[PDB]
């Protein structure tokens, strides 16, 4: 249905803020390669690639939102072009595996262990995103609950596996490294937890237009926390690891 | 006069974006003290203080803008509470001298030279900001040109002195340090140059409401470039200097 002034702007502003955050962080992460040792530059480069891809999609998402509504009679009425919910899920399919690479890369695990860990996590993320999409686009609450519950299964698998692997990497490492890795553990858990909570809004009653606004804003803030903010923690780990290698 | 939908939002969004950028960078700069040597932590702390103060004032600026207009008849009409142009100039009076401290602090000059350099630059910045304010608030174009031209005199003095001092600090320093200091020279010149250009908009013809929107947006983007973005360059210099001290 139609959207109020404040509702259209909240999403409009959220997408504009995301474009700026992704592209500005892309420049930072790319240049920050020169501040860390050679062994950790791949994690910085992948982080720059992640936010560049997300920045491209938020540019497309911004245009899809702008073209979906029209200001008339003091409100925003729905136009003929429907909002493209697929841009975000296509973005997730590409960037979430890259986020997993960035995470494993800064920990410097041996290839015999890093490779099967990455495949299992990447396969799980594809299952998570693929099962979430039909529930995301449904107009039916029961359907949204069923697909979303299925999507929680690989979601819990990824977070459990990453918590254990990050905890196992702590051993022997210097104290400054250990504190950053422990805090990366929590930022991963809390930022990724925003997504299913935001997915739950259309079923907590409330107006359907208010729920749809909350979902779009929630996913956007979550993307900012899980990609550029998370990337800053990866950058700090690379700095301290570079120093420990003297 | 009254403001269109898009005009009120552009400023509304600009102030919201500034609050987020200042407070998020404040947390980063405060914590980044732990990534640099003890001799450079003061520059990081002052940078955190700068953006915390600016964040407070943009919170007050955001509320003053929100309270100055009211949505009615599909437009925004001017309310009884007038917008407070003084918040920004009071903010500049406090943070610009602190920005000058941050700049001198990361260069590690001796006290016999750092102290008189800081006093002369601080006195010039007060003169620059104080003479600019009467021209900023005038409804008369001739008055805006006269006070603004006077304000350009200490403005040019500050930029000339900082260019020379930064250039003189280059000597002997390692190659990685020298490139960052040269780029800090340019970011300072270009970011500070946005302010008088934005000040010029109300005299290039154009609608008065469009000019007022452009001034507020221009100053806000300039503040983001000259405080948190500039602070990231200071942080990089402190990182490379920490390493050169081995
Ligand atoms: C500050 C950064 C501002 C980015 C450019 C501003 C976008 C804009 O004004 O719209 C341009 C045109 C229509 O504008 P107009 O016809 O003037 O109304 O419509 C467009 O948007 C054209 C697209 C031009 C490329 C925009 C790329 C944005 C890069 C943002 C990077 C942020 C880094 C902090
Ligand atoms: C890699 C192969 C990906 C194949 C599907 C991606 C292409 C695509 O753009 O799908 C968009 C459609 C929505 O179409 P539309 O609504 O027209 O936008 O559907 C979507 O929005 C995509 C959401 C996920 C559905 C497909 C998930 C399974 C493909 C992943 C295969 C990975 C193999 C390693
Ligand atoms: C909030 C979610 C991010 C939490 C940041 C955790 C900071 C952390 O790991 O502890 C600080 C230590 C300091 O080292 P230490 O010398 O042990 O004191 O590690 C450091 O060396 C400082 C490194 C700072 C990187 C993290 C700063 C990101 C904050 C982004 C602000 C988010 C705004 C919503
Ligand atoms: C994401 C960060 C969101 C910050 C809080 C959102 C502000 C907001 O929703 O308005 C709260 C109330 C009226 O809200 P409401 O009555 O729900 O309409 O009116 C207020 O604004 C109350 C002020 C609460 C303190 C806001 C402090 C903002 C910190 C932003 C730091 C950004 C770091 C990235
Ligand atoms: C430090 C002493 C500062 C004294 C003036 C600052 C206090 C202040 O809030 O002034 C605000 C008024 C505008 O009042 P209003 O329009 O009511 O807001 O005027 C302003 O907006 C301030 C703009 C600059 C005018 C005063 C500049 C000279 C004071 C600087 C003295 C520094 C001594 C080291
Ligand atoms: C754009 C305005 C800021 C210009 C940034 C200048 C970057 C710079 O100084 O050169 C990069 C060198 C790399 O060192 P090198 O090993 O010589 O290659 O220095 C470094 O080590 C990289 C340090 C990166 C800090 C500057 C990154 C800030 C970019 C903020 C993006 C602004 C978005 C509007
Ligand atoms: C950069 C983008 C990222 C890190 C995407 C994260 C997405 C999730 C963690 C997915 C959450 C979902 C469920 C667990 C609940 C059902 C619906 C989903 C797909 C949103
Ligand atoms: C963080 C805030 C900063 C760095 C403020 C910078 C302000 C200026 C460089 C002042 C510019 C002005 C003139 C040179 C032209 C006349 C009006 C002014 C005050 C805006
Ligand atoms: C850092 C590189 C990102 C470049 C983003 C370009 C986005 C172009 C969108 C074109 C849509 C037609
Ligand atoms: C980082 C500390 C900044 C705290 C900003 C608080 C702003 C409070 C504004 C109160 C206005 C009444
Ligand atoms: C669905 C939430 C999964 C949380 C994983 C955390 C595992 C910690 C166990 C030590
Ligand atoms: C008003 C612009 C002042 C520019 C100062 C740059 C000085 C460079 C001379 C070497």
Numbering used by the authors:
A (entry chain A), B (entry chain A): 31 to 276
Q: Which statements did the authors publish about this structure?
A:
Light absorption by rhodopsin induces isomerization of a single double bond of the retinal’s polyene chain, which triggers structural changes in the protein moiety to perform vital biological functions. Previous studies have suggested it is likely that GR could support ATP synthesis and compensate the poor energy production when the chlorophyll-dependent photosynthesis is low. Interestingly, GR has carotenoid binding capability similar to that found for xanthorhodopsin (XR). In this study, we present the X-ray crystal structure of GR and discuss the structural features that characterize the XR-like protein subgroup, to which it belongs.
